[PDB]
Design an enzyme around this catalytic site. Structure first.
Site, PDB file in Angstrom:
ATOM      1  CB  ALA A 185      -0.941  -0.097   1.015  1.00  0.00           C
ATOM      2  CB  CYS A 186       2.216   3.609   1.938  1.00  0.00           C
ATOM      3  SG  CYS A 186       3.262   5.139   1.657  1.00  0.00           S
ATOM      4  CB  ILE A 187       7.081   1.369   0.096  1.00  0.00           C
ATOM      5  CG1 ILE A 187       8.400   0.908   0.334  1.00  0.00           C
ATOM      6  CG2 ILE A 187       7.134   1.910  -1.217  1.00  0.00           C
ATOM      7  CD1 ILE A 187       9.327  -0.157  -0.375  1.00  0.00           C
ATOM      8  CD  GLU A 229      -3.293   1.942  -2.615  1.00  0.00           C
ATOM      9  OE1 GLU A 229      -2.896   1.538  -1.586  1.00  0.00           O
ATOM     10  OE2 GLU A 229      -4.057   3.038  -2.596  1.00  0.00           O
TER      11      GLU A 229
HETATM   12  C1  LIG Z   1       3.156   3.565  -2.605  1.00  0.00           C
HETATM   13  O1  LIG Z   1       2.230   3.333  -3.016  1.00  0.00           O
HETATM   14  C2  LIG Z   1       4.460   3.500  -3.289  1.00  0.00           C
HETATM   15  S1  LIG Z   1       4.777   4.825  -4.233  1.00  0.00           S
HETATM   16  C3  LIG Z   1       5.190   5.846  -2.641  1.00  0.00           C
HETATM   17  C4  LIG Z   1       6.788   5.710  -2.524  1.00  0.00           C
HETATM   18  N1  LIG Z   1       7.255   6.338  -1.401  1.00  0.00           N
HETATM   19  C5  LIG Z   1       7.647   7.567  -1.346  1.00  0.00           C
HETATM   20  O2  LIG Z   1       7.756   8.024  -2.422  1.00  0.00           O
HETATM   21  C6  LIG Z   1       8.171   8.152  -0.061  1.00  0.00           C
HETATM   22  C7  LIG Z   1       9.445   8.869  -0.319  1.00  0.00           C
HETATM   23  N2  LIG Z   1      10.350   8.095  -0.861  1.00  0.00           N
HETATM   24  C8  LIG Z   1      11.164   7.223  -0.407  1.00  0.00           C
HETATM   25  O3  LIG Z   1      10.927   6.594   0.833  1.00  0.00           O
HETATM   26  C9  LIG Z   1      12.125   6.300  -1.067  1.00  0.00           C
HETATM   27  O4  LIG Z   1      12.486   7.413  -2.021  1.00  0.00           O
HETATM   28  C10 LIG Z   1      12.016   5.069  -1.811  1.00  0.00           C
HETATM   29  C11 LIG Z   1      11.252   4.116  -0.535  1.00  0.00           C
HETATM   30  C12 LIG Z   1      11.065   5.274  -2.971  1.00  0.00           C
HETATM   31  C13 LIG Z   1      13.137   4.512  -2.060  1.00  0.00           C
HETATM   32  O5  LIG Z   1      14.039   4.134  -1.160  1.00  0.00           O
HETATM   33  P1  LIG Z   1      15.537   4.196  -0.990  1.00  0.00           P
HETATM   34  O6  LIG Z   1      16.216   5.444  -1.677  1.00  0.00           O
HETATM   35  O7  LIG Z   1      16.015   3.618   0.078  1.00  0.00           O
HETATM   36  O8  LIG Z   1      15.951   3.131  -2.416  1.00  0.00           O
HETATM   37  P2  LIG Z   1      17.364   2.520  -2.697  1.00  0.00           P
HETATM   38  O9  LIG Z   1      17.207   1.141  -2.437  1.00  0.00           O
HETATM   39  O10 LIG Z   1      18.620   3.244  -2.023  1.00  0.00           O
HETATM   40  O11 LIG Z   1      17.581   2.998  -4.075  1.00  0.00           O
HETATM   41  C14 LIG Z   1      17.700   4.278  -4.369  1.00  0.00           C
HETATM   42  C15 LIG Z   1      18.478   4.858  -5.433  1.00  0.00           C
HETATM   43  O12 LIG Z   1      19.979   4.966  -4.706  1.00  0.00           O
HETATM   44  C16 LIG Z   1      21.054   4.500  -5.266  1.00  0.00           C
HETATM   45  N3  LIG Z   1      21.679   3.766  -4.219  1.00  0.00           N
HETATM   46  C17 LIG Z   1      21.407   2.490  -3.452  1.00  0.00           C
HETATM   47  N4  LIG Z   1      22.558   2.434  -2.719  1.00  0.00           N
HETATM   48  C18 LIG Z   1      23.532   3.043  -2.876  1.00  0.00           C
HETATM   49  C19 LIG Z   1      24.989   3.185  -2.331  1.00  0.00           C
HETATM   50  N5  LIG Z   1      25.387   2.476  -1.501  1.00  0.00           N
HETATM   51  N6  LIG Z   1      25.477   4.221  -2.870  1.00  0.00           N
HETATM   52  C20 LIG Z   1      24.983   5.077  -3.829  1.00  0.00           C
HETATM   53  N7  LIG Z   1      23.757   4.884  -4.407  1.00  0.00           N
HETATM   54  C21 LIG Z   1      23.112   3.875  -3.927  1.00  0.00           C
HETATM   55  C22 LIG Z   1      20.354   3.207  -6.218  1.00  0.00           C
HETATM   56  O13 LIG Z   1      21.110   3.118  -7.258  1.00  0.00           O
HETATM   57  C23 LIG Z   1      19.120   3.765  -6.394  1.00  0.00           C
HETATM   58  O14 LIG Z   1      18.598   4.398  -7.676  1.00  0.00           O
HETATM   59  P3  LIG Z   1      19.409   5.522  -8.396  1.00  0.00           P
HETATM   60  O15 LIG Z   1      19.989   4.829  -9.480  1.00  0.00           O
HETATM   61  O16 LIG Z   1      18.650   6.748  -8.647  1.00  0.00           O
HETATM   62  O17 LIG Z   1      20.601   5.451  -7.320  1.00  0.00           O
END
Ligand SMILES: *C(=O)CSCCNC(=O)CCNC(=O)[C@H](O)C(C)(C)COP(=O)(O)OP(=O)(O)OC[C@H]1O[C@@H](n2cnc3c(N)ncnc32)[C@H](O)[C@@H]1OP(=O)(O)O
Ligand SMILES: *C(=O)CSCCNC(=O)CCNC(=O)[C@H](O)C(C)(C)COP(=O)(O)OP(=O)(O)OC[C@H]1O[C@@H](n2cnc3c(N)ncnc32)[C@H](O)[C@@H]1OP(=O)(O)O
Ligand SMILES: *C(=O)CSCCNC(=O)CCNC(=O)[C@H](O)C(C)(C)COP(=O)(O)OP(=O)(O)OC[C@H]1O[C@@H](n2cnc3c(N)ncnc32)[C@H](O)[C@@H]1OP(=O)(O)O
EC number: 2.3.1.48
Lengths: 276, 276, 276
Positions: A144-146, A179
């Protein structure tokens, strides 16, 4: 005399001072200050550092209030019934709304299960993110949300949350999808996850894989699989049905993926049965 | 040289300096300053303190521009036809949008009546809040939008606004309910109002009351009554129909309510006839 | 130690330091700083002034990456196929989302054409605004989104953008209208444009004009024409059909319009053929 009536411009959570992206309906008085304290264990909000300290000293558990259904050497997941932890879950939903354009009424948590992920280290548990899930979804939505808390974003935690949500679905013997509509941030995270998943399957399992086989192995829906396969240009017809296939591009993407040395979820460590 | 192009980060209204929660389309130039002045009588906006002062000295009425249809020793309500006070009502809608996630085009005020509440004291009238209402609502909504100005929030004014809106409906011999969807803040205020209303009826009027009787007395809809009764666990079947009933919990809630010494609306002081 | 996790509170674009109105999903790390640099030619974003400078020195074109289909002594328009300039157009959509309450996923630019307007002076081209348009619109929308960069707003550029969009429609032999719903800012700009257009036609072309004639000359839809004519009180019936007509009010509005000495689009300078 000028009386200032301020918006909430920062929350203080442990050592982090975080600026909200959107408004959230914390039931607090507007004052000449623009911060509140959020306790990183209880998620309770406080207008004053002193009130926060007072409650901080009280004897509380140091992790989310639910059953620990997964535990490896990197993370734990706790499953929480909104109905059984109303206060805590309401507090979680208020915190989450600060980083979402829209969200259902924060107060009504009964219809949801919350799966909350902590990182553990020498200092114990630290909540880094969660996903909620409807106990009963008409559309079969498996999330639902994340959310990953902003201080922990872009560290790979969001992908772990998504991976976990599909392990639930697999254990349930169902396909599922998040969702809709999704925020841009959410949709781009899902697309990367779906893409990494198909790429890994093609290198680790079989060079050619049918839609049914993928669905069975991943709990991804036909629609999400086809969208992802078309984006990667790996959709074909072989032996009388649609498949995805391995090529040099996919091999290259796989090796770059592995190079990153990411953590993943171990399905063997999910100790959980669907409600039945 | 750095040219700053700022957002509206604060409005100055009398002695109050208020931070907006959301963006509002004030038709003003973006400059290196981040404030405007809002006149607390006319609601006119000004980029400069000097322009504001100039207009402040002009001879104006010191209350909202409509008919005073209710006046007690605490508050007044003014009824304003949007079509007859376009400028003032547009200004009110721009101010209101600063504190709403969404709102209909501020410029088109003709389809609405506005009910604006002032507090009166030794200094005269002070606008504290309002609700708008469609002259003709297909869904029978008795409130379109409702707002307490932020500098006056959490003082009991919102509940007075809601109570007044139902006194209109009662005088109209109609049930009604606020327009959906509601913001979280609005819905929680309505739920408290609905809850306090049923509790008061059970202690002051009759220990057992049918749905028809409640509707007649309150103008609440069947749906809002049932939702509220189920939340309070007071829904029963007696003498062949559904009722709400009094118990110890309700008595306890009533006494806590009265303890708070809140002001209410006196239906006898509403001097008003529906349009016919 | 306090670790600050900041929101994006300002973008630096050339000499301008601009405050966003809404959140936009720039895929950047949250840090203790609250600014990014946006290159005014490439639209690329940078966390550090030094990284920005490094890329600024590289040899790049100094205007938007598309075909120049209109050029007068005041402005140019460039037509860009999202599919052919994915990076640049994604960057444009991220920038645009800072000033919109809602917008489609910024990453998927393939379905759109972008018409980007520059002002030219002794220093060359400067991007001041754009409108996007679906390659295929089920509703015949002739504009999907439209934006004047905030540092250039309220200078008449938005009206030039709208006027250009209707010159495309006229060349296509189709009526069209902007995608709904529109922001308040957008709708008020369209209403002014529609109003100025009818007023100009009545003074410059013919004192009485039928709906068909207006549509043919302007590509405005019947609905937008009638709404605008009713607002101006100029709708009549003459020689067996509906017309708009000239009066003293219209003449007065026309002269005030001309007094302002605005620039307009010259249809003769549009060098363009529809896709066929
Ligand atoms: C509901 O229906 C679902 S839609 C609502 C989603 N939630 C929302 O919008 C709330 C706000 N956002 C978040 O909480 C958040 O942005 C997420 C949950 C959508 C994503 O979370 P994360 O930030 O934790 O995701 P990651 O798995 O980290 O991947 C994100 C990007 O960061 C890069 N990455 C990952 N590990 C890294 C390390 N060690 N060093 C550098 N960069 C890293 C990943 O590559 C990934 O994508 P990019 O290509 O943009 O990096
Ligand atoms: C449209 O369709 C309707 S939905 C849109 C609603 N509007 C909206 O969101 C705009 C922004 N919000 C508001 O304007 C505002 O929040 C209201 C109008 C929704 C509510 O207005 P009030 O703030 O004036 O409401 P109150 O009646 O004050 O009750 C609010 C809470 O404050 C507490 N309270 C009341 N008097 C108090 C005193 N003297 N001391 C302390 N606390 C007081 C009430 O208990 C009440 O609820 P809580 O339990 O949260 O306090
Ligand atoms: C999508 O579907 C369409 S709806 C989404 C619209 N976009 C959006 O909301 C993004 C943010 N807004 C904008 O980008 C922007 O507000 C526009 C594009 C909606 C309008 O752009 P402009 O600001 O450039 O429009 P103008 O043509 O300038 O007209 C605006 C007002 O400013 C006054 N004006 C014009 N020239 C002037 C000079 N030289 N001096 C003073 N004032 C000037 C015009 O009169 C006009 O209207 P007002 O009566 O309010 O001024």
């Amino acid at each position: 005399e000028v009386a200032r009536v301020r918006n909430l411009n920062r929350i203080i959570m442990g050592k982090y001072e975080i600026e909200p992206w959107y408004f959230s309906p914390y039931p607090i008085e507007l004052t000449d200050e623009d911060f509140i304290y959020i306790d990183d264990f209880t998620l309770q909000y406080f207008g004053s550092k002193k009130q926060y300290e007072r409650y901080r000293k009280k004897c509380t558990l140091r992790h989310p209030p639910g059953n620990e259904i997964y535990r490896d050497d990197y993370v734990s997941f706790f499953e929480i019934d909104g109905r059984k932890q109303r206060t805590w879950c309401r507090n979680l939903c208020l915190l989450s709304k600060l980083f979402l354009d829209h969200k259902t009424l924060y107060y009504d948590v009964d219809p949801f299960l919350f799966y909350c992920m902590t990182r553990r280290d020498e200092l114990g548990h630290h909540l880094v993110g969660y996903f909620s899930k409807e106990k009963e979804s008409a559309d079969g939505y498996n999330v639902a949300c994340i959310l990953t808390l902003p201080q922990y974003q872009r560290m790979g935690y969001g992908k772990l949350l998504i991976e976990f949500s599909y392990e639930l679905s697999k254990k349930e013997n169902k396909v599922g999808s998040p969702e809709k509509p999704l925020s841009d941030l959410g949709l781009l995270s899902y697309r990367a996850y779906w893409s990494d998943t198909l790429i890994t399957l093609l290198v680790e399992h079989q060079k050619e894989i049918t839609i049914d086989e993928i669905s069975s192995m991943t709990s991804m829906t036909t629609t999400d699989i086809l969208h992802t396969a078309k984006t990667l240009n790996i959709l074909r017809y072989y032996k009388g049905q649609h498949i995805i296939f391995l090529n040099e591009d996919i091999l290259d993407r796989y090796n770059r993926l592995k190079a990153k040395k990411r953590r993943t979820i171990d399905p063997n460590r999910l100790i959980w049965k669907p409600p039945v």
